[PDB]
Design an enzyme around this catalytic site. Structure first.
Site, PDB file in Angstrom:
ATOM      1  N   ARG A 179       4.215  -3.875   6.892  1.00 28.57           N
ATOM      2  CA  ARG A 179       5.058  -4.504   8.032  1.00 28.57           C
ATOM      3  C   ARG A 179       4.096  -3.857   9.507  1.00 28.57           C
ATOM      4  O   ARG A 179       3.694  -4.528   9.961  1.00 28.57           O
ATOM      5  CB  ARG A 179       6.043  -4.031   8.380  1.00 28.57           C
ATOM      6  CG  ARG A 179       6.689  -5.180   8.646  1.00 28.57           C
ATOM      7  CD  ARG A 179       8.741  -5.091   8.302  1.00 28.57           C
ATOM      8  NE  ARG A 179       9.410  -6.045   7.318  1.00 28.57           N
ATOM      9  CZ  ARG A 179       9.273  -6.224   5.938  1.00 28.57           C
ATOM     10  NH1 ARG A 179       8.423  -6.039   5.435  1.00 28.57           N
ATOM     11  NH2 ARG A 179       9.526  -8.039   5.461  1.00 28.57           N
ATOM     12  N   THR A 180       4.287  -2.590   9.563  1.00 22.11           N
ATOM     13  CA  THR A 180       3.837  -1.603   9.937  1.00 22.11           C
ATOM     14  C   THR A 180       2.238  -1.605  10.467  1.00 22.11           C
ATOM     15  O   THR A 180       2.431  -1.501  11.088  1.00 22.11           O
ATOM     16  CB  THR A 180       3.861  -0.128   9.274  1.00 22.11           C
ATOM     17  OG1 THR A 180       2.603   0.960  10.016  1.00 22.11           O
ATOM     18  CG2 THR A 180       3.397  -0.173   8.170  1.00 22.11           C
ATOM     19  N   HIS A 235       7.305   9.464  11.627  1.00 16.84           N
ATOM     20  CA  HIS A 235       6.865   7.574  11.713  1.00 16.84           C
ATOM     21  C   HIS A 235       7.301   8.022  13.331  1.00 16.84           C
ATOM     22  O   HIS A 235       7.806   6.715  13.277  1.00 16.84           O
ATOM     23  CB  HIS A 235       7.289   6.687  11.105  1.00 16.84           C
ATOM     24  CG  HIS A 235       7.310   5.946  10.751  1.00 16.84           C
ATOM     25  ND1 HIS A 235       6.362   5.014  11.638  1.00 16.84           N
ATOM     26  CD2 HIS A 235       6.847   4.584  10.329  1.00 16.84           C
ATOM     27  CE1 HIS A 235       6.114   4.298  11.221  1.00 16.84           C
ATOM     28  NE2 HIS A 235       6.884   3.506   9.856  1.00 16.84           N
ATOM     29  N   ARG A 282      -2.177   5.565   7.570  1.00 21.29           N
ATOM     30  CA  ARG A 282      -0.713   5.881   7.072  1.00 21.29           C
ATOM     31  C   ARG A 282      -0.964   6.919   5.796  1.00 21.29           C
ATOM     32  O   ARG A 282      -1.861   6.534   4.952  1.00 21.29           O
ATOM     33  CB  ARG A 282       0.165   4.873   6.602  1.00 21.29           C
ATOM     34  CG  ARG A 282       1.272   4.782   5.305  1.00 21.29           C
ATOM     35  CD  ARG A 282       1.934   3.724   5.531  1.00 21.29           C
ATOM     36  NE  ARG A 282       3.391   4.034   6.616  1.00 21.29           N
ATOM     37  CZ  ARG A 282       4.509   3.157   5.832  1.00 21.29           C
ATOM     38  NH1 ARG A 282       5.291   3.217   4.667  1.00 21.29           N
ATOM     39  NH2 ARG A 282       5.547   3.199   7.096  1.00 21.29           N
ATOM     40  N   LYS A 312     -10.864  12.345  -7.553  1.00 17.96           N
ATOM     41  CA  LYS A 312     -11.239  12.810  -8.670  1.00 17.96           C
ATOM     42  C   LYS A 312     -12.737  13.496  -8.424  1.00 17.96           C
ATOM     43  O   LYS A 312     -14.101  13.371  -8.558  1.00 17.96           O
ATOM     44  CB  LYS A 312     -11.568  12.310 -10.182  1.00 17.96           C
ATOM     45  CG  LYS A 312     -10.280  11.611 -10.948  1.00 17.96           C
ATOM     46  CD  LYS A 312     -10.027  10.478 -10.140  1.00 17.96           C
ATOM     47  CE  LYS A 312      -9.053   9.403 -10.674  1.00 17.96           C
ATOM     48  NZ  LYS A 312      -9.119   7.831 -10.325  1.00 17.96           N
TER      49      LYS A 312
END
Ligand code: ZN
Ligand code: ZN
EC number: 2.1.3.2
Lengths: 305, 152, 305, 152, 305, 305
Positions: A54-55, A134, A105, A84
């Protein structure tokens, strides 16, 4: 020449009245007065260390209404990189290299900061550290409060939810708090209680508040609503008195409105949808403005005020 | 010189001569901080002290051109200590480890997620008290207490 | 009118001095003199038959600094197409159709070639066949060698790694080799040895070299470094004498530099990062230039030299 | 007593007074082994030695009722050291750290898989040489060399 | 009263002539003289820390021909326990508790040992540590050598494979080696070479050997064959001279036989299957005897010799 | 003739002093006096609607020390049945058919009950409904309390954990409660608080208790310890004052003991392991006895008391 230049945005705490009153108002017009090409020749990074959509979907759209570019990825699957072995800080140092800016994010909670350090002059936007911050959300939220009630001063606020792990009432609050004397209401079920730190701070400061488990009266002397979500974690027989549900019979209304950084589910009712106080949406559509403001602040040097 | 002192140093030539600060937590310091990755010679033991016997000066620690707060820094693990000077004619005026506000590389966001702990960092935590000592964690904006931290 | 036109790029072997000295120099300025819109009205294909991202993220960014477009996908998961039926050569023949060009990456090792055949006039760029060729990498590498030591002539090279399955020292070498008389050093642990074919060719030609298991002396009479990686495959008690690690005490320095088509892990130390001979990065940021050069060569007809 | 010696101990009362064994790898030992988790007082510095000046006895280390090989054990990090005795009338006959054959908790199968490194172990490695020193790893029957190990 | 009692079996190295000549001969009859109920009232643990099945399926079957029980699991999926917290040594300490014995297999390489320590008096059998030891295999192998050539003395052995990561020629060898003067042949492609430690030991001792890349002559003065497998790891264009394949035209035979702790694939040909020197199988069926021997040694106090 | 016959066991609540004092004592000897074959000719069902293994591995082992059988499965993966159609009550009705009894575990929380109804005369044992009941655990727990302190009467108990979602202190408590006057201690961090229902019941009844956040004094006037676990759910910066950790310096000991239906992680320290008050284990090994008792009660008609 702009306060905001080459500064990395990452935590609401870490920002000044002014500043808020700025993205706040650069976006107000932008909204009334768009500019595609403020940014042309730009590419940006839409890094989705933790898929989010959405963001992301709104961030992005942002880049492009301003004119511009993208290159990014959502992850947890068929995305690569180092693993790794490699460092989110090798990812960046290279990324850093071609990009012009970085929304990004993540799951962990330093990243934007951790990435600041390694990314020399390419500002990072934080769509999320983790359970930490946020800025985009809350300024997104903050405005919207503004175009509505018509000020972030002398309000009647209330946020009924899971104020405990609530990611955004935690920001909201302390931004809505920098400004002044407004009384907050916290309809939380002693378990999604309000943490004893964001308070000592209300108190800390000079500000006020009250408690209730109703949506009721708290509600008539009330102006904008933050209902969070309610979920998992707690038992599944812990969704026992889920009575903190917003729905329809309120009439003992006012001319306030209701908000929720989605996504709603139970919190609130279709029934409402319709009728005023609704907006959860506009609240959303207003993030496309809130972001942009930044990014062009973030990346331009001056303005057409 | 079969173990002791001979705090001949002071510029081009130095010493350090940590002598059990509080007790058995001065070893710590040692790694807790460099100061062994370094030329100048060193001196310690365990005073198993009560301080001093007949007439006791009224101080202890190390002496060796640390900095200023190369300390203030210990404010946390040996607040009750004290630096340098000289017995005939000398300088190290009223200087006590006195809170820094930002320990640096010693420590560890107990938070399990801080990126801290995943890569090429720095422990940087900031200190505020009135309560019983507060430490934030530029990284994962979270607040723990001298405690639970001090350990880790 | 340009040597490069509509020619598909796919294997370094398959390219001529000239050619190298060209992308080599079209990118040098491009670097000093950018052009967004050389390409506008273009769309390209960013086909990620095998997700790859560092390579993709830079390819792409490339398309757009030149001005342009994308449409592509990374795979191994939620990506579709034909499967238990269709041909990577049905994918292409359609793709071929709307696109203007194709970077594309893969697991198998014909693809770019296999795709040439079926894609009539739409050039393919190879980001990878498999374990076979990556032209973009090595020219990316090659340049960078150039802006540094200031020539691809009369050098002191050395590549310490896993020269065996080493994908890029295999290219590098034979490109760095076309040019002349330069002596190469191969600090490889008899197991990541140097294949007996790229040699008979050093020999084959008129060129030279030596062997050592140090990073040491080999190192003072040395100019650019390729440390590859070292990993899996071999036991996990096979990471026994992992002594071919680049780190920090070298001082018995020179004014050379170190490279590594990332991503580093153990190979080399933060400690280094900092100080000269470092670059692994610049080495990267320089792929955004190396690519572009191509694509505009690849797709334009002439130049502003 | 401003830093030194006064190796008064020997039974009900002890000392330890490590004094830079080889150099800047005697700190190690310290953690490398306990010996700081313990009552008796301690003494060190850095001899920045050449050994001794005018007449040099011809020995160094610690003195304090370690065991027998509480050593033999250092055989690996300070083979060139030496224990205890007394200056007038005393006992600690020709005793040199002389290979043990099985270092105990100090070290670490560099092997990435040994269960060692995953749980509640013990470093136990066994030592054989003729080559340049060999160390096995009851755990993951694998053989590495004083080297690459010594580090980790 | 039995040498073997309550001793945990885990590494061939760690076992004595005698011992071998024992499981070796307790199984010979067991084979000629079975006993279900030697074990009744027993339960055992068939722990499959790393699913394995050929090995498990035979272990087990073993428990039951002797009469007895099981409780176990194969993993990597829908198996539980501790994870992101618990210790394979908490697993055991409880397990330890009800069981009477533990075959158990694993990825890591201490486990059986690591588990010894924590499992007080309940012997552990090791079906595998990792890439380390499989005693059951090699004694399984060893015998079988025996019922065949009729002795583990004055032989003509040869093991053509990937003697490098070869898990079992490494054991085999050193068991087949304890016994004496027998000459070994190592048809390995310089890459699946023979490690320089199991040799210095052949040498170390008083023993012999030779090298060849044929299956040929090495083969006429030859008595039992160990062909290992050949795979992954190496390129896939590394399966270039895969010429170390056993197949059918050998005739210049003898009255030897061929073995392979499966599972074959390319190594050897159906064509062979048939005809003598075959056995790879019997070699298998003989593990059901080799195990049993142990377990009843392992758990009984005495014998019906 | 036995109280327990053909009765389905499923919830501790739903059981009577007597009953407890019975499995309690049928297992005490069984423990001192085993019987394989009490059950021969029996098969049972080891249904693992929700894989669980510690519990399964012990259930089972149980079936077999009594002599008997199994057929079962652990799930969440490669297990089948009905799905997108069939009923856990079709599973049962068939199962019901051949079996002689059913341990069975699940995610949902009726199952054992839901399955009672449909499974006519084939008793079900509940290894778990969900977050609801585990009778086997708590009786397993209860005993063990018994062989220790030497009675379930006139005790000093304490359970320090996450008494909130704590599955077993909830049972324990109310069983340990049926018996009498014993005072309980609840070292819980106001969030893993004690639910206000199991109390009103302590109170409800005639019983007592106190609160503390120490492990300390509460501890000297203390006899058996239940430390639960502590985990997820709460933040990960919610593992802030994790101070309710049992470790080693207690000395201000007594001659009590410590328990934990594993699996430990942080709760408690290796260091302890060793020394008395330890047992977490014996606590486990004692479930193999606690179960058996049942199953033979459950399925036989009479006893050798
Ligand atoms: Zn942190
Ligand atoms: Zn090991």
């Amino acid at each position: 020449a702009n306060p905001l230049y080459q500064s990395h945005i990452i935590s609401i705490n870490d920002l000044s009245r002014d500043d808020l009153n700025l993205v706040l108002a650069t976006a107000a017009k932008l909204k009334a007065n768009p500019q595609p090409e403020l940014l042309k020749h730009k590419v940006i990074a839409s890094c989705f260390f933790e898929a989010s959509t959405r963001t992301r979907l709104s961030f992005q759209t942002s880049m492009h209404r301003l004119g511009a570019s993208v290159v990014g990825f959502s992850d947890s699957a068929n995305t690569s990189l180092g693993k790794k072995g490699q460092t989110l800080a090798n990812t960046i140092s290279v990324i850093s290299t071609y990009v012009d800016a970085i929304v990004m994010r993540h799951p962990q909670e330093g990243a934007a900061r951790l990435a600041t350090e390694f990314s020399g002059n390419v500002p990072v936007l934080n769509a999320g550290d983790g359970s930490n911050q946020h800025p985009t959300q809350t300024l997104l939220d903050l405005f919207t409060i503004q175009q509505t009630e018509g000020r972030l001063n002398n309000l009647h606020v209330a946020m009924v939810g899971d104020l405990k792990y609530g990611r955004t009432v935690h920001s909201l609050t302390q931004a809505l708090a920098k400004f002044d004397g407004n009384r907050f209401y916290f309809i939380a079920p002693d378990a999604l209680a309000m943490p004893e730190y964001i308070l000592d701070m209300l108190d800390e400061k000079g500000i006020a508040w009250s408690l209730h488990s109703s949506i009721e009266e708290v509600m008539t002397r009330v102006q904008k609503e933050r209902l969070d979500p309610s979920e998992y974690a707690x038992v599944k027989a812990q969704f026992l008195v889920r009575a903190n549900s917003l729905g329809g019979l309120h009439n003992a209304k006012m001319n306030a409105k209701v908000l929720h950084p989605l996504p709603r589910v139970d919190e609130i009712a279709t029934d409402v949808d319709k009728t005023p106080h609704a907006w959860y949406f506009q609240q959303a559509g207003n993030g496309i403005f809130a972001r942009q403001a930044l990014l062009a602040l973030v990346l331009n040097r001056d303005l057409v005020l | 010189m079969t173990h002791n002192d001979k705090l001949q140093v002071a510029e081009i030539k130095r010493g350090t001569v940590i002598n059990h600060i509080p007790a058995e937590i001065g070893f710590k310091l040692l790694s807790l901080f460099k100061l062994t990755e370094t030329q100048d010679r060193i001196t310690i033991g365990l005073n198993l002290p009560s301080g001093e016997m007949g007439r006791k000066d009224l101080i202890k620690i190390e002496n060796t051109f640390l900095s200023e707060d190369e300390v203030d820094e210990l404010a946390l693990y040996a607040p009750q200590a004290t630096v340098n000077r000289i017995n005939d004619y000398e300088v190290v005026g009223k200087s006590r480890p006195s809170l820094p506000e930002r320990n640096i590389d010693v420590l560890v966001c107990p938070d399990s997620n801080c990126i801290s702990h995943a890569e090429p960092v720095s422990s940087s935590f900031a200190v505020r008290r009135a309560d019983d000592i507060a430490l934030k964690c530029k990284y994962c904006e979270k607040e723990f207490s001298h405690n639970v931290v001090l350990a880790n």
